[PDB]
Amino acid sequence: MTNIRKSHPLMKIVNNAFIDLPAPSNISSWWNFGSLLGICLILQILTGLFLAMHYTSDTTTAFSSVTHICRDVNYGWIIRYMHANGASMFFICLYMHVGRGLYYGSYTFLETWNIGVILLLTVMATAFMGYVLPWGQMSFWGATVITNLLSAIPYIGTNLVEWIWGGFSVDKATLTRFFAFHFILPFIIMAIAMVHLLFLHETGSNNPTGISSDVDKIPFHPYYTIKDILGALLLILALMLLVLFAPDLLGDPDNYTPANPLNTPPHIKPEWYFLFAYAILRSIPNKLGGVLALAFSILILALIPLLHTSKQRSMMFRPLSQCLFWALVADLLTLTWIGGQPVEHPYITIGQLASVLYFLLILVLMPTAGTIENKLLKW
Amino acid sequence: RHRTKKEIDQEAAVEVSQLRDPQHDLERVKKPEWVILIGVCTHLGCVPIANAGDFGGYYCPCHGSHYDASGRIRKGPAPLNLEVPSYEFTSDDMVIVG
Amino acid sequence: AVSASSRWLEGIRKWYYNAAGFNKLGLMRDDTIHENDDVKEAIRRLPENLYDDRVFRIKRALDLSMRQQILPKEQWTKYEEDKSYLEPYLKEVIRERKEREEWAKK
Amino acid sequence: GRQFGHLTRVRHVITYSLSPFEQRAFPHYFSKGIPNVLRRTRACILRVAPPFVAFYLVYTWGTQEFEKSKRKNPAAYENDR
Amino acid sequence: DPLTTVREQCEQLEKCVKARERLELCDERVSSRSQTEEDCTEELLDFLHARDHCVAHKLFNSLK
Amino acid sequence: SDLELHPPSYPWSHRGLLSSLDHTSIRRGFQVYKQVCSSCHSMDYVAYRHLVGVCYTEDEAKALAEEVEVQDGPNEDGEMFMRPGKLSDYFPKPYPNPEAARAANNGALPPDLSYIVRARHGGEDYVFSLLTGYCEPPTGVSLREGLYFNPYFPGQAIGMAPPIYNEVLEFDDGTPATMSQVAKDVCTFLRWAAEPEHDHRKRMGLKMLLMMGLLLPLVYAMKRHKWSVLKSRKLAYRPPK
Amino acid sequence: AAKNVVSQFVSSMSASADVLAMSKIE
Ligand code: HEC
Ligand code: HEM
Ligand code: HEM
Ligand code: FES
């Protein structure tokens, strides 16, 4: 070759994973969440860096600081409400991502699946510390009760909760830590994303049918660049619709109140993206039992590869799992509901059966259904 | 919390057994007139409200747990009673929690 | 002792077969298989006719999927015509490997 | 390695395509959508909608009870007696 | 001036009349058996709601 | 565990996506806060920047901000010798410091109104239905004098003196100062101190909606332009067989 | 779209009404 810009630079060749790559034809709209996933990572970052261009990480000021970003600073208001709302999107997008993987068996790509999982959990940490930066009543308490929930561990716990906090409570020491880790996680996560992409590039994108498409492959540039741009267009739409018309709507927490360590919103809860795991935790009387089961909520993802029982990696051709897949999703919705519920009889009893349903759906029902379907097909 | 000859007795006459947790007021303080508690209801620990409840003690709005005057669990869903931080009375006006 | 029960499974079977949509796509059961290392070798063992067939079928199928269009009612795969053409090939491949595994015990 | 010349082996298939500039990008969209949208939704509805329906009942009932049991402050045990 | 009139009207509707009967018995039950733990507040809490839904819509057209 | 009554979706000029804030209301409301409310509740993030937000001129608010620094002035902030003039000063703190504040109101601590609308669950509805909601304690109920009964407080009891009562103040123009009429204006000024961007953001909304209605359709066509070859595509299979 | 978006993000740095308030006022 001569003057083929792409492979001339070696660097520019590495970018031909976007333009020249084999991309399956058939492909639900669901896959745009990968790309959007990145979109969100880049938006949070640009946004973060500007907010962290006018934010301070002290008890005294932090609330003020945010308050000042939203008042005196030019276009700081949208930047901040764009950053808050974004993170919602970021999660809304994440959970589409994992749904798709669950449903079409994209998770067969074990190595890719394991990175995903790390991805998911890393963002999860990020979101947990950022929300505490503004140091408002919800944030303040939410950190205590989550962090303390780590003191369940018998031997260490206790010592360890105190190291993480940098003291006995959550004063300045903790507050500056979260500021620093919030800042540096996303950068580390981008490396991961790319590592994730790396592995995925070695086997390409699965499809709704569930079969290899090698016999049908398309230009990523021609087709999938417009799709992705279009995806954006809708993604942004949702992010501005939220951010411009209903800034606070999705941000359940109304606690714009500077944190007073004796005061407490009897209704303490993580934002929507954490409710599942909250609910699941409450269902267990015992503290430690609840922390294990909380971890297992999320950490149970990496099992599913091994659970796979059918011969069709595609759920597309299998009824019964399509029914229990949906139910889990609706069980997951049910759990999210509990999250914002008084912890009383009505909700308790419900959550408890939802938390068993979720683990049944994942651990026991689906796997059996797999088998059955295989046996009805005579496979 | 600086109690009262009327308050001490109050908490003194309460029949242990019928207390979720069995805690003599005397095993939870050092010097009767005084009672010092770590304001963290045991349940999910969001601060109680002294002078609230049904057992003349402390209330934790958060979920409906009443705490007596010695601050002993009497209406759940709290698990245990209130903790009593470490503290030695040094001079007659001085006690050091910790 | 299966006369009534196992002559009625075909009833759920039949139900189930057309339930799963792949019927409609013009695809067959063997073409819906998870392409793993054994399937892979079976696949490779196919004659030109069988094997090119499985390529057009999947071509026509992924085309439909891309366009969200179902094949006409007249042109659909009928359960009574279960070409289990991979099965023969696929069995052996497994058979060979089970042996290999076993021979490696001690 | 190389992803385009090395995917698989395909014999005897013709394809026929047309240029963008020769065709229309919106092919009787209302007409296809209705019938296609209709035909897949109706093959989805049964497999998808149920569990959501279920949640709704459980939501509804589940909130009624709460308000009752709590607003029915006399619910547990009556007043007169 | 404005608020005070509209409120009345609102409690003149067949559903306000109907659910005020619980208030009336409440008040008397409670006042006569004054030692009871019965809350008349809780009873009032239904009336108020229906009065106020109404109030809002109308009350608004009368202010500046 | 007491039922809490909830606020009506009270008819507001701004309830609607495009609806915006009514400054005259703001204006009025302001005074309400300043005369009725400055006494025990503070507004720390609010400067004397109503100018354009509240239609008070620069000269108007300068003057309005000057007298507030003459009486409550920077002597309460720590500017020993400070008097009339300045505009960077923030609304004057009812009391030196919180602890005081609770003493003046006996244990209770007058919440900073800056964000009340956006703080407390339930927005300006709650705030309006609190002030305008004050009814007779319920048969068989007891009330410590401070504990006035209010139909909309969580715990069913608030330490609030006559928030607002008819003819509490008088507005320049002549707006009929009804308990409620004044509340409608007081809330509105709160809405705004809570979210000063209210109007700009709804504006942009408008411009983001039009734009997006031009880009969404456009961009979709692009997407079909390109893909068309694929979708229009037809296939043939001719083995030698 | 890009123009305003970018512009907002750069003015976010230009000069905060906080500071600018005191500017030119002595
Ligand atoms: C002193 C005389 C006050 C004036 C004038 C106003 N408020 Fe007030 N308010 C005051 C106290 C002491 C308290 C505490 C209540 C308690 O029981 O702790 C309050 C409370 C409020 C609330 C309640 C919010 C909540 O805690 O749930 C609101 C919404 C409120 N104050 C707003 C408010 C407004 C808008 C006023 C002017 C129109 C106003 N208050 C006047 C004391 C005083
Ligand atoms: C996806 C990765 C990230 C996510 C999920 C995320 C999420 C969040 C959330 C939920 C908040 C709380 C905001 C609120 O509700 O007030 C927040 C705040 C903040 N974040 Fe991010 N963020 C991410 C990346 C970043 C990055 C990369 C930076 C810096 C470059 C950053 C800087 C900040 C700052 C300074 C705040 C504090 C002020 C505020 O509340 O806006 N964040 N983040
Ligand atoms: C930081 C968050 C993430 C980013 C930026 C990201 C990005 C991407 C992108 C750009 C793609 C290719 C397109 C697509 O299929 O949609 C992809 C594919 C994939 N991702 Fe993610 N991802 C993230 C999170 C996750 C999570 C949490 C998991 C699972 C636990 C996951 C698992 C997968 C899988 C299995 C695929 C391949 C599917 C297929 O095409 O067959 N991803 N990811
Ligand atoms: S956190 Fe105190 S009773 Fe529940």
DSSP string, A259-305: P-TT---SS----HHHHHHHHHHHT-SSHHHHHHHHHHHHHGGGGHH
Cα–Cα dist E50/E44, whole Å: 10
Which chain A residue has the Cα nearest residue D46? A323
Residue in B40, B60, B83 to alter for ligand 4 test, most ligand atoms within 8 A of Cβ? B60
Q: Do the chains contact at G8 and A74, CB–CB below 8 Å?
A: yes
Residues 6 or more apart whose CB falls under 8 angstroms from that of G14 comprise A74
Atom of ligand 1 nearest to the CA of F127: 29
Method of elucidation: X-ray
Q: Give A143 Cα–ligand 4 centroid separation in angstroms.
A: 17
The contact set of A with B (CB < 8 A) is 141, 145, 262-264, 266, 268, 343-344
Q: Which CATH architecture has domain A1-379?
A: Up-down Bundle (1.20)
For residue A247, give the 3-state DSSP assignment: coil
Q: Which of F43, F62, G22, F188 is nearest to A67 (CA)?
A: F43
Q: Mutate which of A103, A214, A221, A328 to test chain D, going by most D C-beta atoms within 10 A?
A: A214
Q: Which of A244, A214, A294 is nearest to A85 (CA)?
A: A244
Q: Do the chains contact at C69 and D40, CB–CB below 8 Å?
A: no
Strand B49-50, strand F234-237: pairing: unpaired
- Amino acid type, A265: P
Domain with residue E45: its CATH number is 1.10.287.20
Q: Give A97 Cα–ligand 3 centroid separation in angstroms.
A: 6
Strand B65-67, strand B58-60: pairing: antiparallel
Q: Kindly report each contact of residues A57-65 with a partner whose C-beta sits within 8 Å and lies 24 or more positions away, as own/partner.
A: A57/A133, A57/A175, A57/A176, A57/A178, A57/A179, A57/A180, A58/A172, A58/A175, A58/A176, A59/A135, A59/A171, A59/A172, A59/A175, A62/A133, A62/A134, A62/A135, A62/A175, A63/A134, A63/A135, A63/A136, A63/A258, A63/A259, A64/F45
Residues comprising chain G, all counted = 26
Chains within contact range of chain G (3+ C-beta pairs < 8 Å):
A, F
- The region, left, alpha or beta by phi > 0 then psi within -120 to 50, assigned to residue F100 is alpha
Q: Kindly report each contact of residues E45-51 with a partner whose C-beta sits within 8 Å and lies 24 or more positions away, as own/partner.
A: E45/F3, E45/F5, E45/F151, E46/E19, E46/E22, E47/E11, E47/E16, E47/E19, E47/E20, E47/E22, E47/E23, E48/F5, E48/F133, E48/F135, E48/F151, E49/F5, E50/E10, E50/E15, E50/E16, E50/E19, E51/E7, E51/E10, E51/E11, E51/E16
Q: Do the chains contact at A22 and D3, CB–CB below 8 Å?
A: yes
Burial state string for A133-161 with b = 16 or more CB within 10 A and e = fewer than 16: bbbbbbbbbbbbbbbbbebbeeeebeeeb
Residues with CB under 6 A from ligand 1: F 32, 36-37, 39-41, 105, 108, 110-111, 113, 116, 120, 127, 130-131, 158-161, 163-164, 186
Please tell me if residue D19 touches chain F, with a CB cutoff of 8 Å: yes
Please tell me if residue A45 touches chain G, with a CB cutoff of 8 Å: no
- Amino acid type, F50: H
Cα–Cα dist F182/F30, whole Å: 10
Q: Which of F120, F49, D59 is nearest to A248 (CA)?
A: F120
Which chain A residue has the Cα nearest residue D54? A330
Q: How far is G1 from chain A (nearest CA, A)?
A: 11
Which tokens in the block code for residue A298?
A: 């999320």
Which tokens in the block code for residue A77?
A: 């208001």
Residues comprising chain B, all counted = 98
B41 is in an annotated binding site: yes
Residue F186 CA to chain centroid, in angstroms?
9
Which tokens in the block code for residue B42?
A: 């045991």
Q: Which of F17, F21, F20, F22 is nearest to F210 (CA)?
A: F17
The answer to whether F115 and F47 have CB atoms below 8 angstroms apart is: no
Q: In chain A, what's the furthest Cα-to-Cα distance?
A: 74
CB-based burial label for A278 (10 Å; 0-12, 13-18, 19+): buried
Cα–Cα dist B62/A264, whole Å: 8
Cα–Cα dist F182/F166, whole Å: 8
B70 is in an annotated binding site: no
Count contacts between C and D (CB, < 8 Å): 17
Please tell me if residue D25 touches chain F, with a CB cutoff of 8 Å: yes
- The region, left, alpha or beta by phi > 0 then psi within -120 to 50, assigned to residue B71 is left
Residues 6 or more apart whose CB falls under 8 angstroms from that of C37 comprise none
Q: Do the chains contact at C21 and D10, CB–CB below 8 Å?
A: no
The three-state DSSP-derived secondary structure of chain C is CCCCCCCCHHHHHHHHHHHCCHHHHCCCHHHHCCCCHHHHHHHHHCCHHHHHHHHHHHHHHHHHHHHCCCCCHHHCCCCCCCCCCHHHHHHHHHHHHHHHHHHCCC
CB nearest E3 (choices: F3, F141, F179): F179
Q: Do the chains contact at D43 and C21, CB–CB below 8 Å?
A: yes
Cα–Cα dist A67/A256, whole Å: 9
Which tokens in the block code for residue A319?
A: 């009824």
Q: Do the chains contact at A50 and G8, CB–CB below 8 Å?
A: no
Which ligand has the shortest distance to the CA of B77?
4
Please tell me if residue D70 touches chain A, with a CB cutoff of 8 Å: yes
For residue F194, give the 3-state DSSP assignment: helix
Vertex C41 angle, CA C38 and C45, to 5°: 135
* Domain extent for E40: 1-64
Half-sphere exposure in the Cβ direction for A40 (13 Å, CA) = 27
Residues 6 or more apart whose CB falls under 8 angstroms from that of E13 comprise E54
A196 is in an annotated binding site: yes
Cα–Cα dist E28/C83, whole Å: 84
Cα–Cα dist E57/F9, whole Å: 9
Cα–Cα dist F170/F182, whole Å: 10
Cα–Cα dist E16/E54, whole Å: 10
Which tokens in the block code for residue A195?
A: 């590592």
The answer to whether F183 and F20 have CB atoms below 8 angstroms apart is: no
Chains within contact range of chain F (3+ C-beta pairs < 8 Å):
A, C, D, E, G
The DSSP H or E segment spanning B95 is strand B95-97
* Domain extent for C5: 1-106
**Residue A25, Cβ neighbours under 10 Å: how many?**
20
**Bond from prior residue into F110 cis (ω within 30 degrees of 0):** no
User: For residue B60, what is the DSSP state?
Assistant: E
Place of tokens 């759940």: B76
Residue in A123, A133, A188, A239 to alter for ligand 2 test, most ligand atoms within 8 A of Cβ? A133
Instruction: Say what angle helices A287-299 and A110-130 make with each other, to 10 degrees.
Output: 130
B60 is in an annotated binding site: yes
- Amino acid type, E49: H
Vertex A38 angle, CA A37 and A41, to 5°: 95
Backbone dihedral angles phi then psi of residue A60, each to the nearest 5 degrees: -50, -50
For residue B66, give the 3-state DSSP assignment: strand
Place of tokens 């305008």: F132
Which ligand has the shortest distance to the CA of F183?
1
Closest Cα to atom 17 of ligand 2: A130
Q: Do the chains contact at A334 and D4, CB–CB below 8 Å?
A: no
Residue B86 CA to chain centroid, in angstroms?
14
Cα–Cα dist A267/B44, whole Å: 11
Q: Which of A371, A319, A325, A331 is nearest to A103 (CA)?
A: A325
The DSSP H or E segment spanning B58 is strand B58-60
Q: Is the dihedral of CA A197, A198, A201, A202 positive or negative?
A: negative
Q: Kindly report each contact of residues F17-22 with a partner whose C-beta sits within 8 Å and lies 24 or more positions away, as own/partner.
A: F17/A245, F17/F202, F17/F205, F18/F202, F18/F205, F18/F206, F19/F202, F20/F198, F20/F199, F20/F202, F20/F203, F21/F188, F21/F191, F21/F192, F21/F198, F21/F199, F22/F188
Residues with CB under 6 A from ligand 3: A 31, 33-35, 37-38, 41, 94, 97-98, 101, 106-107, 109, 112-113, 116-117, 119-120, 123, 189, 193, 196-197, 200, 205-206, 301
Place of tokens 């601050």: B71
Please tell me if residue A52 touches chain G, with a CB cutoff of 8 Å: no
- Amino acid type, A350: I
The DSSP H or E segment spanning A14 is helix A10-14
Closest Cα to atom 42 of ligand 3: A116
**Residue A194, Cβ neighbours under 10 Å: how many?**
11
The answer to whether F190 and F127 have CB atoms below 8 angstroms apart is: yes
User: For residue B84, what is the DSSP state?
Assistant: -
What would the DSSP string read from start to end of D12-81? SEEEE---TTTS-SS-SHHHHHHHHHHHHHHHHHHHHHHHHHHHHHHHHHHHHHHHHHHH-TTTSS-S--
Q: Do the chains contact at C66 and F231, CB–CB below 8 Å?
A: yes
Place of tokens 């001036």: E1
Q: Do the chains contact at B46 and A343, CB–CB below 8 Å?
A: no
Q: Which of C28, C37, C47 is nearest to C93 (CA)?
A: C37
Burial state string for A213-230 with b = 16 or more CB within 10 A and e = fewer than 16: bbbbbbbbeebbebbbeb
Tell me the H-state helices in chain F: 23-31, 58-71, 98-104, 116-119, 123-131, 179-194, 198-232
Catalytic residues of A: 201, 205, 227-228, 271
Cα–Cα dist A188/A171, whole Å: 26
The answer to whether F48 and F89 have CB atoms below 8 angstroms apart is: yes
Q: Which of A339, A346, A353 is nearest to A277 (CA)?
A: A339
**What are the C-alpha distances in Å from A246 to residues A45, A55, A108, A251, F202?**
22, 24, 39, 9, 10
Residue F135 CA to chain centroid, in angstroms?
25
**Residue C87, Cβ neighbours under 10 Å: how many?**
16
Which tokens in the block code for residue B19?
A: 């207390």
User: For residue D5, what is the DSSP state?
Assistant: S
Indicate the resolution in Å. 3.0
Task: Walk me through the domains of chain F, giving residue ranges and CATH numbers.
Answer: 1-196 (1.10.760.10), 197-241 (1.20.5.100)
Cα–Cα dist B41/B48, whole Å: 6
The answer to whether C32 and C67 have CB atoms below 8 angstroms apart is: no
Cα–Cα dist A268/A339, whole Å: 9
The DSSP H or E segment spanning B50 is strand B49-50
Q: How many helices (H) and strands (E) does chain A have?
A: 16, 2
Cα–Cα dist C51/C43, whole Å: 7
CB-based burial label for B52 (10 Å; 0-12, 13-18, 19+): middle
- Amino acid type, A379: W
Residues comprising chain A, all counted = 379
Which tokens in the block code for residue C92?
A: 């052996």
- Amino acid type, A84: A
The DSSP H or E segment spanning B75 is strand B73-75
Q: Which of A109, A48, A98, A124 is nearest to A308 (CA)?
A: A109
**How do the domains of chain A map onto residue ranges?**
1-379
Q: Is the dihedral of CA A359, A360, A365, A368 positive or negative?
A: positive
Number of domains in chain E: 1
The answer to whether B79 and B69 have CB atoms below 8 angstroms apart is: no
User: For residue B87, what is the DSSP state?
Assistant: E
**Residue A328, Cβ neighbours under 10 Å: how many?**
22
The DSSP H or E segment spanning B49 is strand B49-50
Which tokens in the block code for residue C46?
A: 């196919």
Number of domains in chain C: 1
The answer to whether C34 and A313 have CB atoms below 8 angstroms apart is: yes
Cα–Cα dist B68/B14, whole Å: 10
A221 is in an annotated binding site: no
Residues 6 or more apart whose CB falls under 8 angstroms from that of F80 comprise none
Burial state string for E24-53 with b = 16 or more CB within 10 A and e = fewer than 16: eebbebbeeeeeeebbbbbbbbbbbbbbbe
Cα–Cα dist B84/B21, whole Å: 14
**What are the C-alpha distances in Å from A161 to residues A150, B1, E32, F151?**
6, 29, 57, 42
| Binding-face residues of F in 120-179 toward D, CB within 8 A | none
Contact yes or no, B with D (3+ CB pairs under 8 Å) = no
Residues 6 or more apart whose CB falls under 8 angstroms from that of C22 comprise A209, A316, A317, C29, C32, C61, C77
Q: Which CATH architecture has domain D1-81?
A: Up-down Bundle (1.20)
- The region, left, alpha or beta by phi > 0 then psi within -120 to 50, assigned to residue F14 is alpha
Cα–Cα dist A281/A293, whole Å: 6
Which residues are paired to A23 by β-bridges? A218
Contact yes or no, E with G (3+ CB pairs under 8 Å) = no
User: For residue E13, what is the DSSP state?
Assistant: S
What would the DSSP string read from start to end of A125-192? HHHHHHTTTT-BHHHHHHHHHHHHTTTTSTTTHHHHHHHHHTSSS-SHHHHHHHHHHHHHHHHHHHHH
Cα–Cα dist A207/A310, whole Å: 16
Residue F215 CA to chain centroid, in angstroms?
34
Cα–Cα dist A121/F70, whole Å: 56
Q: Give C8 Cα–ligand 2 centroid separation in angstroms.
A: 60
Q: Which of A304, A331, B27, E59 is nearest to D58 (CA)?
A: A331
| Cα end-to-end distance, chain F, whole Å | 81
Vertex A180 angle, CA A178 and A185, to 5°: 90
Cα–Cα dist D35/D66, whole Å: 44
Please tell me if residue D19 touches chain E, with a CB cutoff of 8 Å: no
Which residues are paired to C3 by β-bridges? none
The answer to whether F146 and F106 have CB atoms below 8 angstroms apart is: yes
Task: Walk me through the domains of chain B, giving residue ranges and CATH numbers.
Answer: 1-98 (2.102.10.10)
Cα–Cα dist A176/A166, whole Å: 10
Q: How far is F43 from chain E (nearest CA, A)?
A: 25
Q: Do the chains contact at F139 and E56, CB–CB below 8 Å?
A: no
Cα–Cα dist A29/F222, whole Å: 16
Which tokens in the block code for residue A11?
A: 């660097």
Residues 6 or more apart whose CB falls under 8 angstroms from that of A97 comprise A33, A34, A37, A116
Atom of ligand 4 nearest to the CA of B46: 1
Residues 6 or more apart whose CB falls under 8 angstroms from that of A260 comprise A137
